[PDB]
Symmetry: D2
Subunit: 255 residues, 4 copies
């Protein structure tokens, strides 16, 4: 008797057992969801990781920059869940920005690197929704991972720009998803240890737990995974094109 | 096997069976919560309304402008739930603005005594209720208030919109205090619910909402409040969850 | 000058460190003809306004006094001359008792104190606009002083709530002011100095100030009201003609940076 | 004049209806000395309509060689020993697959990427190239529109503006090191073939704007926008950076 009992949910973005998507997948399975997982590039390695989840789940290859992968995705998911069955949820937990656009001066990132980062981190949220909406049930839910990019910060540079673009994409995806009776939302998380940039990240994370009224544990992805599962559930049925902040309330406090 | 099984939750704001608080109370009981209800002034009238709920719940008097009611509130709740027991949730679904400050009356013609009363009941009372009830709340607890998006001005709602802007700010400070108790504080910003300026506001809502908006149905709002009362949004505080069909995310 | 020939009312001078004193000074240097309003200590205020570069009539205005508001337009008209109207209005008024802003716990502020603070700090922006819009020229401008209340912070407590209410009042005043061809905007300033709190609150406030200069990409000088006064004068001018119901941030860009 | 003696670079003139043409005109009326940049294949015939002579330099923001030589070419135009006091970015582009009648999901990434390169990334490119030749107290201004809420038709151009707002906040961090401000002006729609359906959607967007704006909005008039940009280029908003000034008649502050 789980929060997601009988729901068929696709979860992308597992690379390690520290990945936010690994925790989202774990909590969803504990809550009765039947999963379909998608992995990028290191498929043999991802299968070794996903074996650590509480239940077996089919693993499909998905490189969001690969148009052929996107074109075959719905068909491959239908084969995995059975003809006549559709998805109730989709989790986008994919992000990438080359080291020139993260960590290196903001002005020194070449556009080919920024473009690749925006493709994977923002445009792919629209790509995945385009591919999967035709195989989603009414009352369904699409959830993506974000971080608050409303204010600039050290080091995250072009990845912050990519998140600003992702929040805008999310609002357009909601217009399309609504036609199917599906919601589209992002979860803006606090910093999670998933694996002078070092001094910047340290100062960011320190200021986090201090600014958060309920505190913030950077080593624990469970509160974020639970928030994603709340959006996948039937309990936020009138929320779409929106952002839910799972950050300990830090974005609501100046100091 | 409900979302709020074994949770003790206080729900204020029931006046009719169309009140948002009535639907929040109904959904919370369906989800296994044990409720304590608070009402204002017409307690006999409110008691008859609460008989329509699926389960019996004690009804306590609470006029948020009455300091004596606030001073005795925790003691009265403790008598209702039993000594040694604490609340897991609190729902503030209280609002009021006199006709001079909300409606057809020019924005400039509302006297301050009316605006002040409206702000007292609609915004300051969210702090008053948290002050009174935080000493009797469990860690992991949740305080939820009802709001509407006041980030842009609109016809008619005038000073009530100002009171909601003040309420959003109050919620952010209540979160700082509530965090000391391991308690979250959040608001649910709802679309218009039936509980021709208002008709035009509603039409534009269902049009802007990507998933549409049914003004006659408080259930999606009640479900959202229950999601915040649950253990499923444990890292959200001082925040606003929009149960408005996504209308605030679309220009047109 | 930027404000050559403009008739502008400026409220909120109490000392020569008041933001309104600097706004009045910059406005006069820019050719504006002022009318000043003061509260309670009129003899004291008169001595302060003698430190401004030009003489300006001083009118009494307690924003909690309805008789003062009812007679304001008539008293301004007598000061500027019959047939003349105001081109600008500056609201630089704020008040919150020590129970609502300072060391006192957020929960311990009684409503009579919060209500007085909201009356003076937020509601009076609407009161002043109601009183003065009938004597304002098309192309006119109303400007109020604010601080960013979108996130909670230590100590400012109910004054932060009052500023959240003021931002909302500003959006409604813009709807009314537009009927007269008049703009309404707020300037959100960084902290300006315009042991007493004890070691604990004193350290919290010091961190708030230091953090501001650190976050501001162009820095922030807490001793200097001039960049704020210049911003208010930009809004009083004809150079932001399509901005209304809005907030302009004169804070060194601090609100645009997380750290 | 508001900009007496200031040396200001203005990019983005293509026609005499371009917002940059009006910004350039108002800047010259206010005493500025301009350097203009353009990219097309005869902009000089258009820039000749301005009240004063101004050197015109070629700048394709997707061209790394043009960006690498820009500061040197500007220095040659304004004279050795002189620096810029202002920079105006009034450049935007989104192919018809990403903005217009095309479904949001049907825009291919190569088209969106080109749109983002020109409309958002180039704001950082121009600041990188010109900050080394800017005076303290200088100002960089870019053109934007409010992308906080989704809307019909503008689709990927709205996404590009969301990215541009974020870029501006990072440019402000870099510009601050030089004592230079970086801000955007978010304008309402300006009139600078779609069919009945999209034509009606755009008409509703326009009508809605003038009705929401407490002071109204004249879509045929770029002058209020040009004036706002000149206010940011001036010394009168000295403590504003990484920010957005709305020259939209106050429409963004009103729901209805
Ligand atoms: N870790 C945090 O602090 C944090 C905070 C907020 C948001 N987020 C976001 O959460 C998401 C997941 O991050 P994480 O911390 O779990 O890191 P992670 O490295 O474990 O996950 C990123 C995932 O993106 C995948 N990916 C990269 N390129 C891809 C491509 N072309 N096609 C498909 N998948 C691709 C990787 O394989 C990986 O599984 C990201 O969007 C990230 O920005 C993370
Ligand atoms: N109805 C909507 O469209 C809508 C939309 C968004 C938010 N809200 C908010 O939700 C809340 C509930 O509103 P509703 O629509 O259920 O209307 P309602 O009239 O049914 O409920 C308002 C409640 O406030 C109570 N109240 C008034 N004065 C009080 C006092 N002195 N002490 C204690 N309680 C007092 C009333 O008794 C009543 O129960 C309000 O804050 C309202 O602003 C309503
Ligand atoms: N750091 C700062 O100082 C700071 C930052 C941002 C915004 N502001 C705001 O700027 C404004 C002016 O503040 P200041 O720093 O110049 O302080 P101040 O103490 O010099 O000015 C406040 C003014 O309000 C007046 N006032 C109070 N009660 C009044 C009443 N009933 N009727 C009429 N006037 C009344 C006072 O007489 C005084 O002139 C306030 O709104 C304040 O919140 C200040
Ligand atoms: N017109 C409006 O309603 C409106 C509203 C808000 C904001 N804006 C923005 O204002 C800016 C100017 O637009 P406009 O309406 O004046 O239209 P425009 O077509 O006159 O200006 C766009 C300019 O971008 C230039 N450009 C395109 N690709 C370029 C490249 N590779 N290198 C250099 N320059 C390049 C074009 O040559 C042209 O000068 C754009 O950023 C636009 O999004 C326009
Ligand atoms: C190479 C690459 O791009 N890897 C994927 C990846 C990219 C970025 C992140 N990421 N990390 C962190 C972090 N913990 O430092 C991160 O922390 C935050 C940064 C800023 C905010 Cl506001 C909140 C959290 C965000 C984020 O997206 C996580 C994984
Ligand atoms: C007289 C009085 O104050 N009664 C209590 C009360 C006060 C205000 C509301 N209220 N009603 C409505 C409505 N549907 O008309 C209302 O609708 C909205 C108004 C604006 C927005 Cl942004 C969203 C919803 C808000 C609100 O608070 C409901 C009840
Ligand atoms: C007793 C009283 O109400 N006096 C009037 C008055 C009230 C408040 C302020 N005020 N002071 C300060 C300060 N300490 O620098 C102040 O600093 C800031 C606080 C927060 C922010 Cl976000 C920005 C600035 C704000 C403010 O309104 C100034 C004057
Ligand atoms: C072909 C091409 O990309 N030309 C450059 C260009 C790109 C976009 C625009 N542009 N046009 C308009 C318009 N008036 O239709 C425009 O209108 C608005 C759209 C949305 C908002 Cl919120 C405000 C204004 C924005 C914009 O950027 C103008 C020029
Ligand atoms: Mg700094
Ligand atoms: Mg209008």
């Amino acid at each position: 008797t789980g929060l997601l009992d009988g729901k068929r949910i696709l979860v992308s973005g597992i690379i390690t057992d520290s990945s936010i998507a690994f925790h989202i997948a774990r909590v969803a399975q504990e809550q009765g969801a039947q999963l379909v997982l998608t992995g990028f590039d290191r498929l043999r390695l991802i299968q070794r990781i996903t074996d650590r989840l509480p239940a077996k789940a089919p693993l499909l290859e998905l490189d969001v920059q690969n148009e052929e992968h996107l074109a075959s995705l719905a068909g491959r998911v239908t084969e995995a869940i059975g003809a006549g069955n559709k998805l109730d949820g989709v989790v986008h937990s994919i992000g990438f920005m080359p080291q020139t656009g993260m960590g290196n001066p903001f002005f020194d990132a070449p556009y080919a690197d920024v473009s690749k980062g925006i493709h994977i981190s923002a445009y792919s949220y629209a790509s995945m929704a385009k591919a999967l909406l035709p195989i989603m049930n009414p009352g369904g839910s699409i959830v993506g991972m974000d971080f608050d990019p409303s204010r600039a910060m050290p080091a995250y540079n072009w990845m912050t720009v990519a998140k600003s673009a992702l929040e805008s994409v999310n609002r357009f995806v909601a217009r399309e998803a609504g036609k199917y009776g599906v919601r589209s939302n992002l979860v803006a998380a606090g910093p999670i240890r998933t694996l002078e940039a070092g001094a910047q990240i340290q100062l960011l994370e320190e200021g986090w737990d201090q600014r958060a009224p309920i505190g913030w544990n950077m080593k624990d992805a469970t509160p974020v995974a639970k928030t994603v599962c709340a959006l996948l559930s039937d309990w936020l049925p009138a929320t779409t094109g929106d952002i839910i902040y799972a950050d300990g309330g830090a974005h609501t406090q100046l100091l």
